[PDB]
């Protein structure tokens, strides 16, 4: 039997789901047909309405304690939770019910991990990441796979690791798999030689831009952002933000939307600070 996976969607933009199907290896088609059993996912599922809600009830009982609960997006606490309604009820109630009997949770993306864009000031819906919603008493692992969205092969890499090696990957203090989130962008950035030489893009499309100089002065948040973008890179290893000429905006880090303007320079650069 293939590992049961319930993929819930709260307040979200669906970018993590989209990223997942970009995976070059394994292909999403093979993940779904041969590796996991994607038992619920409002994005791709044939069933709607009452027929869809029947699956949640059935999987919860039949596979009690044995399904992985993947969560994209997050629960709002304002509007009595009814800024995200599923089956006529707050999404938060769906999330809680399914979390109760999960084997483990995967928090896909910055929404589920931290809050992402809806949580940026002033957070009108009181959108709350999954771990904070469930609280300190929650007794199953929550694997945070942050990024807006995460890299496709990182998402499928977490799943294949669990299926191949029969354990949760080692997590850092923030719950992120060391597999992918244990270096900063700037710790493995091919433009670092330019940073070191004080060779920067000073204005868009200047001499430096056309030579691929460092993007620190135009707002690159690579110095403070832990992710695999400069190592695994994006879309089958085709590019990453910095390669294509825009600084990292910090999109996998807790609170990145309110850290400062994306064109503000990154902080804590000096050891004598």
């Amino acid at each position: 039997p293939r590992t049961p996976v319930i993929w819930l969607h709260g307040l979200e933009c669906t970018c993590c789901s989209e990223s997942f199907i970009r995976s070059a290896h394994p292909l999403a088609k093979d993940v779904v047909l041969s590796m996991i059993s994607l038992d619920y996912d409002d994005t791709l599922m044939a069933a709607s309405g009452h027929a869809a809600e029947a699956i949640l009830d059935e999987i919860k009982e039949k596979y009690k304690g044995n399904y992985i609960l993947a969560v994209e997006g997050n629960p709002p606490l304002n509007q009595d939770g009814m800024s995200c309604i599923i089956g006529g009820r707050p999404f938060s109630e769906q999330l809680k019910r399914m979390a109760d009997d999960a084997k483990a949770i995967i928090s896909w993306g910055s929404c589920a991990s931290w809050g992402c864009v809806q949580a940026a000031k002033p957070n009108p819906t009181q959108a709350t990441p999954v771990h904070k919603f469930l609280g300190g008493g929650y007794d199953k692992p929550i694997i945070k796979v942050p990024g807006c969205p995460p890299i496709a092969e990182v998402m499928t890499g977490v799943i294949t690791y669990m299926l191949t090696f029969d354990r949760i990957p080692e997590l850092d203090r923030q719950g992120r798999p060391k597999m992918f989130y244990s270096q900063r962008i700037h710790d493995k950035c091919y433009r670092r030689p330019h940073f070191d030489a004080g060779q920067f893009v000073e204005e868009w499309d200047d001499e430096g831009a056309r030579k691929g100089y460092c993007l620190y002065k135009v707002g690159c948040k690579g110095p403070t952002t832990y992710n695999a973008c400069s190592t695994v890179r994006w879309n089958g290893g085709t590019s990453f933000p910095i390669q294509s000429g825009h600084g990292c905006i910090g999109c996998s880090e807790d609170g990145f939307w309110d850290k400062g303007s994306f064109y503000s320079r990154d902080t804590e650069m000096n050891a004598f600070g």
């Binding site: 789901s17 038992d39 995200c84 309604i85 940026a120 499309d205 085709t238 294509s244």
Partner: protein
């Protein structure tokens, strides 16, 4: 009650109520309720957007140069189109003209999104309303091959052994007892009309499309760093060009990256022509007797217009906009997003508050203040809606109207507008598609009488689905033209990608307002910004699904989703395949609709 709408519908909620929540195979969260009469014909339809995040509120006080990244995250399906609308809005406010290569690269990214979004929509979201994968298990692989060769003679992948191998895989999946996404599908509903062979061909192409789709977005990764959510900037594109100079290998765009883009464009064109367009035409032929779902498309359609052959000259738009009203295709009303009497949003049936709720607000004057409040006729409670009260506030989607008219937006609206304005590429696509449709119909029914009525043909759920596929093909051809123009510009000495004259806020006026429009995959998108002293004073989005998924307005006009369901018979109201098929044909993006 029986409500006689000004747009000529009779909304009657006396019949049996059917509730669909969640509506799946969309982006985001929707609820739909209908009433059916004694003959199982829909006589009332209620569109409820069931999420809201408040991007318009979140943007306040921030730097206009940062806006594109916030609003991009309105949606990861139509990823990039909000960033494009944002940079255009800021550039409009601040009187910024971008270099031609920035124009072209943004249009290349836009057309990449159109192709990717349309393909994934049709296969991964829509197809299961037309295709029965369980029935595919009954197909003869040789007959499936024969059908494939007729449907798309150029597509190489037609071996009977290949179709048999696909069938074995789906059989193994079914035999496992872990049915995944197929579980509880309405597979015994006679609303499914494909032969087993057509079902197997379509399942095969769902898999081919899932494999293909990750390739085309590599164009976004090259120009924009990543997909989903590629990078943009005010004043240009960040992907600086250096073909032949010092450190070219380290530039975002060099000879190798250009060669990669060429290869990706051609692969997309081939998939559009050999797989996607032929499938939609052939599936339409199987459903030739199911012409429901036209709704407003027959009467009131709108787009802002896009893809000018000459940058900044809308008379050259390759998908020209305007509004057709009351079914008069001979009269294109000009649409001006700056005119406060044209685009207005009402909230009387939405979960928002205005100081004066009789008013429709043009988006420069828009207000987004949440007001989640259920009508006193609601069945259920505040946190448990059993049957929503559509006589009161029933959606997180605002109600946009154009000069007080409810309109449909989307590829079908654009195709009508382009056909009516004599765009020869589109006229040729429409007429050749009708001829092909009629040819496949005759394969299926040798006594078929050709369809000739273009309004009946286009103005349907089938037509809406077809227009999306045709638009994908058109975008692939246009993208190749854009690429060739980019190479020409570079060859002629222009590698420039950004204008920075107005990058610094000290160069801005103290007060400015701007609007940016986009022909987004689902229809007419615009963002309206008001800037004060370097900061965002108001930022209001009206997005395609806001138009289509709109609740009723103060006069009682129904929007495109509700209109499209009216008068549709259901084989089995409790297995609402027809409702899903029609709603899905609008490609609802609910995160977009509500933002």
């Amino acid at each position: 009650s029986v409500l006689n709408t000004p747009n000529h519908y009779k909304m009657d909620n006396s019949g049996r109520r059917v509730v669909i929540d969640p509506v799946t195979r969309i982006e985001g969260h929707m609820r739909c309720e209908v009433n059916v009469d004694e003959n199982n014909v829909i006589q009332n339809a209620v569109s409820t957007g069931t999420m809201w995040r408040g991007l318009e509120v979140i943007l306040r006080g921030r730097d206009p140069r940062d806006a594109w990244a916030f609003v991009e995250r309105i949606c990861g399906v139509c990823t990039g189109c909000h960033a494009l609308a944002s940079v255009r809005a800021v550039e409009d406010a601040l009187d910024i003209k971008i270099p031609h290569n920035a124009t072209l690269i943004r249009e290349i990214m836009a057309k990449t999104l159109q192709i990717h979004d349309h393909i994934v929509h049709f296969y991964h979201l829509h197809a299961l309303d037309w295709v029965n994968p369980v029935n595919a298990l009954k197909a003869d692989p040789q007959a499936t091959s024969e059908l494939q060769k007729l449907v798309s003679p150029h597509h190489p992948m037609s071996s009977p052994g290949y179709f048999k191998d696909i069938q074995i895989r789906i059989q193994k999946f079914v035999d496992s007892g872990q049915l995944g996404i197929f579980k509880n599908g309405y597979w015994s509903n006679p609303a499914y009309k494909l032969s087993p062979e057509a079902d197997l061909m379509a399942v095969t192409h769902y898999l081919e499309a899932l494999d293909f789709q990750k390739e085309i977005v590599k164009i976004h990764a090259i120009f924009g760093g990543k997909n989903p959510h590629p990078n943009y900037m005010v004043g240009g594109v960040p992907c600086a060009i250096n073909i032949d100079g010092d450190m070219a290998a380290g530039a975002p765009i060099n000879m190798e990256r250009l060669n990669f883009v060429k290869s990706l464009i051609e692969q997309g064109r081939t998939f559009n022509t050999n797989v996607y367009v032929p499938d939609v035409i052939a599936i339409a032929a199987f459903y030739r007797d199911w012409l429901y779902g036209g709704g407003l498309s027959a009467t009131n359609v709108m787009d802002y217009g896009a893809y000018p052959k000459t940058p900044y000259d809308k008379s050259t738009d390759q998908l020209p906009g305007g509004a057709i009203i009351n079914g008069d295709w001979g009269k294109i009303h000009p649409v001006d997003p700056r005119d406060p009497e044209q685009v207005q949003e009402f909230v009387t049936h939405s979960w928002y508050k205005y100081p004066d709720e009789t008013k429709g607000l043009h988006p420069w004057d828009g207000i987004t203040e949440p007001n989640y409040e259920l009508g006193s006729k609601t069945k259920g409670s505040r946190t448990n809606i059993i049957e929503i009260d559509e006589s009161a506030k029933y959606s997180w989607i605002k109600s946009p109207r154009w000069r007080g008219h409810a309109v449909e937006v989307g590829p079908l609206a654009r195709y009508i507008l382009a056909y009516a304005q004599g765009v020869e590429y589109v006229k040729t696509q429409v007429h050749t598609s009708l001829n092909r449709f009629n040819a496949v119909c005759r394969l299926l029914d040798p006594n078929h009488k050709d369809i000739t009525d273009l309004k009946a043909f286009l103005g349907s759920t089938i037509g809406r689905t077809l227009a999306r596929a045709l638009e994908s093909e058109y975008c692939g051809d246009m993208m190749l033209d854009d690429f060739n123009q980019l190479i020409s510009n570079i060859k002629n000495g222009d590698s420039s990608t950004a204008n920075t004259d107005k990058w610094d806020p000290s160069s801005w006026p103290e007060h400015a307002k701007g609007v940016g429009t986009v022909a987004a995959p689902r229809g007419a998108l615009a963002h309206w910004i008001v800037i004060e002293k370097g900061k965002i004073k108001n930022y209001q989005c009206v997005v395609p699904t806001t138009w289509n998924g709109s609740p009723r307005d103060p006069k009682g006009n129904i929007g495109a989703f509700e209109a499209s369901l009216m008068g549709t018979p259901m084989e089995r109201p409790d297995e609402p395949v027809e409702v899903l098929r029609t709603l899905h044909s609008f490609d609802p993006c609910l995160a977009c609709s509500t933002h």
